[PDB]
């Protein structure tokens, strides 16, 4: 059966994680390539550097993240935020990023995510979707969740697929950071729409809410609040989640 | 007593508004100029202008959307997104903007907020915050919702008018775009923490939301997608909330 993954989303900031978390066992939680050695020690499956800045300096920034942490990590990571064309992602896929997301230009260009898994295979291309329900009908957000595209939830993913994205990163932004549970009805709504990995982002809080995400449907739970304030051990969820029976993977913990 | 005012939201990118809202009564609903005179033309009390890029080219780009709106509307307006430092806070008012909203450049230099109002008069710094309920407790969040500062709502509010800000425009980001109310609780418990004036923004989606917003105490209604879409219209809008009592200004309607 297919691995249920755990990812821990690192926010970024002019090349450096955003910090203030106490990390009394680390020399400097800070740093992209210490922090993402770290969990890969302590079970994590995948990270996702997201820049969440993705402005200014930015692309150069991320660039020089890349190769630092591609040299040093021996788990998979995704770079993501303002991905804005082609050549910015294939920059980040050949210095080392085993996977870009994609979202705001992918909605704008479509066949980007086509052009990025034709060169790099399907694999290194995750597109990042947002969504909110708006008067009972999910639709897809660009700009930081402040454009309502009018692109239904259900169309966008189904077109998605058929570009030839790798993987979708589903973002329930009214949601995210509040530790109040992943948006499972979301969830559950994109399942059958898509054959595609879906990695689940926004929401977690405590170690029930990856498990209610994964019978929702989700291949994946990435969370950035639990693991920044240190909020959730990564082996006793991954325990948890085995005895209620989600495939995820203990091996090396 | 104090007026309430009902104010549009223009979202920008590269120094126009975004379109694709089919006003056909007009020549180019993606003209700030053309646009923002019509709203004044049809009861909008002020307007904001939110670069929701906020990025690149940005700072140019605003600056010659403030220099052609300002000569050729009547009513107030704002400018925000990205507004990272004095100086362009600065060069914005002198251009003929009213006011400018600092949400993630506040949280990280509090005196910015006193450094605009001495220079340019409290009325001329909004600031912006963005927040969310987390396990319970409001919290502020800055980067376009993406990080939660773990500073409570209730210790922000009261620090930004020690620090002399003129408004507070509270955006609920969970409700924001939904449709489904603006987020009474939230304006209801930053109510009494601050004498300033409240703009609340995220959630409108018919006319009954802006009566529980103003019943909320909310002195100032913002909204982005009711207008975009033409969903509400303002002097309809108006009528009502005045028939229900808020002192609304109906003079030129």
């Keep these: 059966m297919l691995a249920k993954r755990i990812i821990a989303c ?44 993705a402005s200014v300096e930015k692309r150069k ?5 890349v ?21 910015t992602a294939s920059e980040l896929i050949l210095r080392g990023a085993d996977k870009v997301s994609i979202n705001t230009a992918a909605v704008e260009n479509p066949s980007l995510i086509t052009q990025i898994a034709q060169t790099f295979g399907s694999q290194a291309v995750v597109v990042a979707i947002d969504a909110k329900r708006v008067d ?11 454009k309502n595209t009018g692109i239904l939830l259900r169309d966008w993913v189904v077109e998605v697929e058929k570009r030839g994205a790798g993987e979708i ?25 898509t054959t595609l990995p879906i990695i689940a982002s926004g929401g977690a809080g405590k170690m029930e809410h990856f498990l209610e995400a994964f ?8 969370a950035a609040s639990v693991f920044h304030f240190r909020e959730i051990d990564v082996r006793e969820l991954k325990e948890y989640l085995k005895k209620h029976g989600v495939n995820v993977r203990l091996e090396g913990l």
């Design 10 to 53: 690192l926010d970024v900031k002019d090349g450096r994680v955003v910090k203030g978390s106490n990390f009394e066992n680390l020399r400097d939680s800070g740093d992209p390539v210490e922090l993402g050695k770290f969990y890969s020690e302590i079970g994590i499956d995948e990270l996702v550097f997201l820049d969440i800045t």
């Design 61 to 65: 920034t991320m660039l020089e993240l």
């Design 67 to 87: 190769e630092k942490v591609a040299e040093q990590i021996d788990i998979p990571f995704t770079v993501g935020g303002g991905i804005h064309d082609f050549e």
């Design 136 to 146: 009972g009908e999910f639709m897809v957000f660009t700009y930081s969740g402040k």
């Design 169 to 193: 990163l589903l973002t329930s932004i009214d949601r995210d950071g509040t530790k109040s549970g992943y948006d499972t009805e979301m969830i559950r709504f994109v399942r059958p729409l």
């Design 215 to 222: 019978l929702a449907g989700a291949d994946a739970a990435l």
